[model samples]
Target: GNEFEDYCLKRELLMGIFEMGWEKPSPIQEESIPIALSGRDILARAKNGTGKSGAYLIPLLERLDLKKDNIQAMVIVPTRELALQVSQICIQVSKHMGGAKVMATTGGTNLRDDIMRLDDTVHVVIATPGRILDLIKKGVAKVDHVQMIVLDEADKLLSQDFVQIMEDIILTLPKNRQILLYSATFPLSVQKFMNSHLQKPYEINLMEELTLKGVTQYYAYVTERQKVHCLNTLFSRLQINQSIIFCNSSQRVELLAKKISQLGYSCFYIHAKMRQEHRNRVFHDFRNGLCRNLVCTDLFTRGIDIQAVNVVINFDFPKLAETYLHRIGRSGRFGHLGLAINLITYDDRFNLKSIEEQLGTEIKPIPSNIDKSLY
Candidate 1:
């Protein structure tokens, strides 16, 4: 009964799922698929890489009226990178289904292109809130017929920065629209929106624990100036197949990547300041094995889980517990073993302790000699 086939999805959709190498329903997917298919709003909390996307995507694609030729489902993500990732998955999963058109629009791209694309029939749209709201206000996106709206990182979407745009965007949706919110962690802020918007939504919480089961976290105490040196040492010692180094800002991301490259390692970097095409190119090459290391800002945090990445380094510690969780969550995807290393400076000590306490996960001190098989 847990098999994807048992869900009785459309023949083409099931084929798409199988071809995508998804053999069965994950816990979140199994619980969410039926309820979502029943056209109920959903508030789902599943850890990163546990098939949260599939949970909503399967049901969203299932209900699409391909012949109708109008927007039926819209997927909202927090970052442009995540918007691209989700839309790519949507494209791959719906490849055999043919008429279902999935488009991803984010703030960094051209607005004219979005308008031009909207002229044609786009059944499903995956976008960041700002651009999608822009499209809706400009009368380019006709959401009057949209049956489902999904918020991929519901916690981030509910943050103060995005709340205004999100509020405006939701007001445009038809009153009968099914709203689905998915995230690894849902803060109290989500409760406010749920009460006001959702109509007896089905809640699915698959996060038995906040920390990933396959990840072992550790911290290396170092000075701000010694951080890069510590990283070089880790590079030499760890059997990191691929690594993502998180920095606090775009400036630090570039500086660190340059430093790593100067140290004779192939490294790439991505940040919010970069152009959309360049960011895409960096991520493309990094994912395709062009580089063994990537230094990036928190922009890559939310839902960009590259399977080959075995190590995640916090070049600069995160201020909040949630950010720390998402940053470290990048590695150890889908139950694969991985490692999370935090470089803690004197100033970062309090934050590291706070994050550890808040998450209820221990970040042990890195021993002088780490066991080879620990990672």
Candidate 2:
């Protein structure tokens, strides 16, 4: 409702916020900053575009004991890009506070570099679950005094594949440490983990509706053979500023990227199997506006935010409503106008309908003459 000054944060951090061009708090920030600052465990759900990072980062930075030379806080994210992105935010927002020592560690990077970085003062550690646990086990990265730990994409980390690692990390934190979980969608089953780990968590849900308000969704019916042609047609007609095309599998991702490139449109493809260095380059290049389109699997979904993306093409419709919601959210960030088009096949008809009904959102059929003003 008012300026960031209302939170009574440090003067240097407030200046850093202003210099970073955040004039005021977004809705999630307004709701979460104070409560988080009070050292409460928070389970927060808000639209992907709605400043969730600022909500957690502001308070996390404000509560940091910069004088101490050990890791005081840790942020666990689902993907390498997300780890880098969050750490970048921490670095920028804490620029005026003598730059809080923030380091991003992920499995793909060199272990030696990470160990060397941890040899000195590191106030914040943003990492993936496996790598962080490795450091902890090796006695290289100590977390005995960490006051708070955040699960950026809590829903993802809570999945069966990551549950063991998540528990291992939680077991290492101090008993009174604040545990904050944030995500756009939380499967109800996560309540089990919450009940077990968190101490009467403060839940904050900002999504009155699951789907984003600024994205207009539509589907184009085509057979498997005709899907490539349909995508080419969409490329010709839509005024796409920059777009992300999703494929169900990495094999399909490469195939689609090849087809799009053969059609003479600039495209880059990435997936989980690719080398970590290559993945980092592709993500950086795309975000830097070096390419117009990106083709990838769900690895790009969790919490990747690119503001220039005005269009999102589901080259192959996802099987789950949650996947669809996250894919389309690539656009329409922060209430900006964007478009999400799906390429649906006969076999996908039921999945499409179910996803629509489950989300309580409509995906209209693409109209022939589209107004350019919408995206």
Candidate 3:
């Protein structure tokens, strides 16, 4: 029950997991996968870097009947980037499945190409809600036969903004379909929605503490004017190879990235407003180490993964504790040791306390760096 082989996964799947370079199943996977393989709906939550995606992805990939050309599994995510990213993971791990089709769709792609691509036989579809809805309505994405439906980041999707569209999409699918919902945090509204929809679901809580393990949390108290200086100093001091500077707003993201670059650091920023191609390019370059420092909004949070990132600086503290987890989780991924540094001014003191209380972990201020230093 401890190792992936304990599940006695099919040879192909077992090979795929090994090929994906997963050293071992994380806590979420260990608890959620077996119940999921039994064909149960799951309402599960684990922290951002705890392999929550694989908890569902592994089971769904196994359940997929590759012999069938119809879409047997569907994964709906919040953003175009995530849809592509998840699909890539599927393609990577499912390599042993032998040309089994997995396709992704998003709002930013050319509409004709998406519909045309659907012309091929597909066994799995990963798509954002809006794009999938368009295909479903246009008679391209065959949904009636979808046996497994997964809502990644369910909390983000099960909201006032996207709930209606999601509900409409669900109504078109077969009622007997299995539902799997996963997120770092599931609010009461998401739970209520699941109650009405998911049938006799078994829930998993690997993130009982709701904070990352193996990540050291530190804060550097500073004046608003001094935050930039502290961040610059932290870079100069810490042995940071790659880092993400998170800002609460897009303007701040751009401003910080520019200022940091103007200060002679290599940095780039991304947000929703950026053109899809530009954003994609930035993401690609960042992933390939073309950019050492990425200044981003919450768009880079959620399920994005970049390897060997040593530090995460909250240039602007997040509004929600869950956002804080996702921000810091950019590092310490897959149980690797990493650091989360919060640059706190007096105005952000209350928010820091709020995050600490909700996540059940105290973030100690970095002591030696306490002097009132100006940039």
Candidate 4:
């Protein structure tokens, strides 16, 4: 049987998926659908572009009863951007299937409005852990009737110290509900959580090949002071249209954005410390091409899908290997060709080695053409 047909999705929905230019199921989708459709628990570990979202999303939609007005499914994501992105995907995928009503709840938004929307016939609720837990505390949003729940980017959530909130969310949900845990990496913490939370879950790990296969990876070694100059040279040399520059700290992001602005580059910075509204505006501007460059902290590493990002610059190496994968994964998305450049300094050697060790790959170096005396 054809892969799409085997999933038992409506013919119209299959056509819509095709119209969206997805002809075949990815590895995760192919492996996960059978278990998901069987109503069994699932713990899937696939790379960023392996269609992990669609794996559970399709099965969740298959189980949705459009006639019911209650919330049938809930997707818990780590970041607000991910909540919005997943919500959009859910709506898009369910468009031809009687238009499933999906709402996303997250921090940095009006709570009362979210509460009001919860009273409506929402079939799906995509949310962050904090906001969803908050709504659950109130009488507005209830998880008792949800038949399916998914934790996207579960690894990131755990690493960010959201375990308490995750535990609270799990405790609030119905015991019989199907649970799906998705992440790019399966660390010890995630494994422990799964051993306790998931019951006979099917495990799918697709890490033989890197998700950013089409993305060109480059590294440049420079002194700490020459980092900014190296970035300027790369920007000018590559003529990148739009790129996300990843920094290790919020202060560094702000400082780099300011320095780049002084260089006449249209850049904006985003981090957890900034006002929610300001961060939203900056994200919007970058997405809409109003800004050509966005210097962001590790906060932007996971779950956010920004298309048309031709380049990714790692101003500072991430402390974790999972972060490096997600940061570089931002550039090459949906099989698009892209580039990721990491600026390596002497101080970054340890972090770089750690990343390479985790990835089980050798880090290649790019020789600098600029004069060393200038530094």
> Looking at model 2, which ten-residue stretch has the lowest summed lDDT?
205-214
Q: What is the TM-score of each candidate against the true structure?
A: 0.55, 0.55, 0.54, 0.54
lDDT of 4 by residue, 1-375 (tens): 347787787776687677667788877788888789898988777665535777788888888888888888999888887776777777788788876888888996788898888887788888888898899888688667899999888887766479788877888888888999898887745755664567767657633323443456677778889999988888787746678899888988888888989987788789988898998887988789887888888775353466667788899877777777777653222555667788989978888876665554445665455322211
Write down the lDDT of every candidate, Cα atoms only.
Answer: 0.82, 0.82, 0.77, 0.76
Q: What is the C-alpha RMSD of each candidate to the true structure, in Å?
A: 16.8, 16.8, 17.0, 17.2
lDDT tens per residue, model 1, 32-91: 899988888888776656357777898999998888988999999899878877888888
- Residue pairs that clash (backbone atoms under 3 angstroms), model 1: none
Report the C-alpha lDDT of model 2 over 1-375, residue by residue, as the tens digit: 588999999999999899989998987788788888887888777555525777788898888877788888999988887887788888898998985788889998899988888888888899999999999989999899899898887778877788789889988888899988887676733544554567756667633323354678899889999999888888999888789898889999998788889988999899988998999899999999999999998885454477888998888888887788777753222566778899999989999998776554678998998877888
- In candidate 2, stretches whose alpha carbon ends up further than 4 angstroms from where it belongs are 206-375
Q: Model 4: runs farther than 4 Å from truth?
A: 206-375
State model 4's lDDT.
0.76
Candidate 1: global Cα-lDDT? 0.82
* Residue 348 displacement in candidate 4 (angstroms): 38
